[PDB]
Amino acid sequence: NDDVDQSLIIAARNIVRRATVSADPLASLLEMCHSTQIGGIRMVDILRQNPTEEQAVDICKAAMGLRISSSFSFGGFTFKRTSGSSVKKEEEVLTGNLQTLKIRVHEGYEEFTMVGRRATAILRKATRRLIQLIVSGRDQQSIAEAIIVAMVFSQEDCMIKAVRGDLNFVNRANQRLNPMHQLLRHFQKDAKVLFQNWGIEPIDNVMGMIGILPDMTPSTEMSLRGVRVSKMGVDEYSSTERVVVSIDRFLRVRDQRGNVLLSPEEVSETQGTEKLTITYSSSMMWEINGPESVLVNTYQWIIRNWETVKIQWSQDPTMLYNKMEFEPFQSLVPKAARGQYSGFVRTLFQQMRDVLGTFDTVQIIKLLPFAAAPPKQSRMQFSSLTVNVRGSGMRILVRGNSPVFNYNKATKRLTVLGKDAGAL
């Protein structure tokens, strides 16, 4: 139960992380979710049974047409609106650096329950204002994280005008973050100016409640405006409804009303160790076990599906070259010589078809991944073809064997960087 939940989080995150970089994240996510196994069982089956509420996991559930929490993730915290309501109002605001940010202001009194990985809090909010913030946490650092998220979430004018410099944050795919996430990522790096400009007020130590100061230290006497830290743990226990959600190509999970509940920006960067053995069968996830395993899995896949490849190679070669299974291999090839190696190898195959009785098989399986890229005019007679592993550029010789591709004709077995990789 617990080992399945933990491995499901680590599984789902790696898929959502990989999906964002792809040209069709939604399709890539489904391809990987339908192919991946976790401890013998399919992930497709796990997502139906398992009630694990997590950012990356719920994005997978949304993709397959399953219900998820009505709550939304912001700054890695799940916001459960226990009471109140609001209405949207799109407004432009100038930061401290005079940068205009178009933000959806929520007009109305609302009570939230922030649920974090290292912290918990009960937020009381009004229009462009924070009324109160009761907070628990493991350490003072985890408390500060929740405070910074709550200060940005309130959208106060002091928070906007505390910004210093230009906000140009981007995700893994080099795409600008929305105005609210621009503020989070700024203040998460450093927010001493925010804490200073927010405002301090005197407090009463009463309900096991203590203050917190701009330097992130405990204080019985005074505290930040609206912020109280409970010595004990915050009691919550409020079930959220499982609601139907729509999901677009960018993995932006939206509820019935049209609010973005989840996104790949909310998926945590933590990469835990796997309890149960996760088995990714998708070609996109050959990169997960390093560049070394990519070269192994590429030549394995060709050997496994050789009879199909051989028919394709002869008749429709453009179909073969444009397979998505050669994309991991092509990332390892140096960007300068990607099209040049493709042009070289695609000639060598043309000559093989032209001269008819020059059919090598070993040479084809060896060089076929280089032909995946769009070809370019090469001067030719490449002694070797560089393929960048971890830093070091291990080169594959055209004629004969190499450290990367070692085939012994006696054994009829392929060795790739020491490890075995199929047989014919």
From TrEMBL:
Q: Where is this site: Mammalian adaptation?
A: 376
Range within the parent protein? 252 to 675 of 759
Keyword check for Iron-sulfur = no
Protein name (database record)? Polymerase basic protein 2
The entry's keywords: Cap snatching, Eukaryotic host gene expression shutoff by virus, Eukaryotic host transcription shutoff by virus, Host gene expression shutoff by virus, Host mitochondrion, Host nucleus, Host-virus interaction, Inhibition of host innate immune response by virus, Inhibition of host MAVS by virus, Inhibition of host RLR pathway by virus, Inhibition of host RNA polymerase II by virus, mRNA capping, mRNA processing, Viral immunoevasion, Viral transcription, Virion
- Which superkingdom? Viruses
Q: Polymerase basic protein 2 helical domain: from which residue to which, for each copy?
A: 1-68
- For the keyword Protein biosynthesis, the answer is no
Which GO terms label this protein's molecular function in UniProt? RNA binding; RNA-directed RNA polymerase activity
User: Which residues are in the Influenza RNA polymerase PB2 sixth domain?
Assistant: 280-424
Instruction: Please give the biological process terms from Gene Ontology that the record holds.
Output: 7-methylguanosine mRNA capping; cap snatching; DNA-templated transcription; symbiont-mediated suppression of host cytoplasmic pattern recognition receptor signaling pathway via inhibition of MAVS activity; symbiont-mediated suppression of host gene expression; symbiont-mediated suppression of host mRNA transcription via inhibition of RNA polymerase II activity; viral RNA genome replication
Chain ranges of the Influenza RNA polymerase PB2 CAP binding domain:
69-279
Query: Where does it reside?
Result: Virion; Host nucleus; Host mitochondrion
Q: Which GO terms describe its cellular component?
A: host cell mitochondrion; host cell nucleus; virion component
- In its UniProt entry, the species of origin is given as Influenza A virus (strain A/Vietnam/1203/2004 H5N1)
> Which spans are transmembrane here?
none
- Main subcellular location of this protein, as a coarse class: virion
Purpose of the protein: Plays an essential role in transcription initiation and cap-stealing mechanism, in which cellular capped pre-mRNAs are used to generate primers for viral transcription. Recognizes and binds the 7-methylguanosine-containing cap of the target pre-RNA which is subsequently cleaved after 10-13 nucleotides by the viral protein PA. Plays a role in the initiation of the viral genome replication and modulates the activity of the ribonucleoprotein (RNP) complex.
Q: How is this protein organized at the quaternary level? A: Influenza RNA polymerase is composed of three subunits: PB1, PB2 and PA. Interacts (via N-terminus) with PB1 (via C-terminus). Interacts with nucleoprotein NP (via N-terminus). Interacts (via N-terminus) with host MAVS (via N-terminus); this interaction inhibits host innate immune response.
Which family would the database say this protein is a member of? Belongs to the influenza viruses PB2 family.
